[PDB]
Write a protein that binds this ligand. Structure first.
Ligand code: NQ3
Ligand code: NQ3
Lengths: 304, 304
């Protein structure tokens, strides 16, 4: 019993972190096999931050200008290339600690763990969701660029995020491991609209099922609703519209608890319309949307 | 910017986790040097759970009855001893992945990371506080016993907790690494009073400083208070009395923000008396007490 915002064990990712320095900028890199991946803005100086011409900036750099250090040992760079917003530095040594891994592009509403790093050294690990507007609400300071987000399925690490930027609003933006930004963002020091965010409805319902499993049940009521009626409420409260695909993904939780998905939607409708009345659910005084239905099943069943 | 409930990177601890089986019970062990530490209740069966005679139960076991497996490899047990509520199994091989470590007894109100494990395999990592009543509100299922809590200072892991029990109330209890329970608990399947808990005042103040540093400032007011006046409010709201020692530990945060500790106490007094009025602080709709002043400084300065 108990339900916590749990991150994946970070060990397999810690063994991939390196420091990358180019000129006067230092950030983190991810060393997998004989390639080090890092944000391309490592080649920038302050003057070329408002609108860097990355192609021109990279043309002034040679393999020997990319200083890559894995703890105390220096890696020899034998190639460099830019793919979208990431640099790929080919090194002469494959990382002996490379885990089984994949590069994935996650969907908005999905969750992942972040290993925050500075100077190639791990600082901490936390779980978060990719917002529907493709930003993340992380904890990142200057020097954290190149820190990565990931999920782990048994012995395989699926890398889904690399940190690049803090928007002027204090929220974070980054790319997949092929250097493609999530959302409309560009790697420039400019104000950029993130767009309307919404609450991840399917996740809030999953967390309400986690609450019932762990004994917080005060929010269960005598009511039911329909997808149409619930979606009118979701529209009013800036929640993502619930679809049959979301209802289907909540199937295992509905089967485990015996609470029909539309019945849980009626409880969520009442909490949206009436608030929590000074009460808490799983130690939270707001409706939590950073646990997917898969997260709830995993945590409630002890998957390792 | 951004503030998250961050856990320490778990890698150094993952390399110490082993599975321990005795008879029909399997739980986790911590392999440091040539010793494996695990909860002594691994030697129990269901019949002897209400009140086990651990001395008698252990007398029926020999070194060869303790099956210790580190991933796929079996460790040879050459000795066994019970120290308080923990068993120490001496093995013939020192763990090659033993980090620099210490065993510490943490104080109530201090925080630590937990690496939840099942069958010797890491499942997830989360940060929590040792409650003032010496319980933890964790996320643990059957099989998680032997999972440990720790802090990391550079390359040294300070192990402070080993999980033993879930009380009938769903909260958790465990020991230091010498097998001494935190709190009044005993390792028996019996209802046990945990005692009145309180909110960790110094931590809530630290988190309010973290909020101001990250831009959430709506709760700052034109008022001040005294330790005496604030403590009358803390008494009414079941908060720990604030002392000069707590004020002194908040010194760095008060210096960084320019907000006098008693001025922040006046903001906390107003939030206690008036509530949040439907607003949030660092994404929370309640007053958070799981960040120590040290945690706030570390996260706000990027310590690795
Ligand atoms: C200062 C900071 C804090 C947290 N995460 C990231 C940062 N951070 C460090 C550099 N950049 C940056 C901003 C815009 C464009 C480009 Cl190419 C880089 C940034 O946002
Ligand atoms: C079932 C469970 C779930 C989460 N954490 C722990 C457990 N859990 C597994 C065994 N015990 C136990 C209870 C009382 C006394 C003793 Cl010696 C052992 C327990 O509490």
């Amino acid at each position: 019993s108990g339900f916590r915002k749990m991150a994946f064990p970070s060990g397999k990712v810690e063994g991939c972190m390196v420091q990358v320095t180019c000129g006067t900028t230092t950030l983190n890199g991810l060393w997998l096999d004989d390639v080090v991946y890092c944000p391309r803005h490592v080649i920038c100086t302050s003057e070329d931050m408002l609108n860097p011409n990355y192609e021109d900036l990279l043309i002034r750099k040679s393999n020997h200008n990319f200083l890559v250090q894995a703890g105390n040992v220096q890696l020899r760079v034998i190639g460099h290339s830019m793919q979208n917003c990431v640099l790929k530095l080919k090194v002469d040594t494959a990382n002996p600690k490379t885990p089984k891994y994949k590069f994935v592009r996650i969907q908005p509403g999905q969750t992942f763990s972040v290993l925050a790093c500075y100077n190639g050294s791990p600082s901490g690990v936390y779980q978060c969701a990719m917002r529907p507007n493709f930003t993340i609400k992380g904890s990142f300071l200057n020097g954290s660029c190149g820190s990565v987000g990931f999920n782990i399925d048994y012995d395989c690490v699926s890398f889904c995020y690399m940190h690049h930027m803090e928007l002027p609003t204090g929220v974070h933006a980054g790319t997949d491991l092929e250097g493609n930004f999530y959302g409309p963002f560009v790697d420039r020091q400019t104000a950029q609209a993130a767009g309307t965010d919404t609450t991840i409805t399917v996740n809030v319902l999953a967390w309400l099922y986690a609450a019932v499993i762990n004994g917080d049940r005060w929010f269960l009521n005598r009511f039911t609703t329909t997808l149409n009626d619930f979606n009118l409420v979701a529209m009013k409260y800036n929640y993502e519209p619930l679809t049959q695909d979301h209802v289907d993904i909540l199937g295992p939780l509905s089967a485990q608890t015996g609470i029909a998905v539309l019945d849980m939607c009626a409880s969520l409708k009442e909490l949206l319309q009436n608030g929590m009345n000074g009460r808490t659910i799983l130690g939270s005084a707001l409706l939590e949307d950073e646990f997917t239905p898969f997260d709830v099943v995993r945590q409630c069943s002890g998957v390792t």
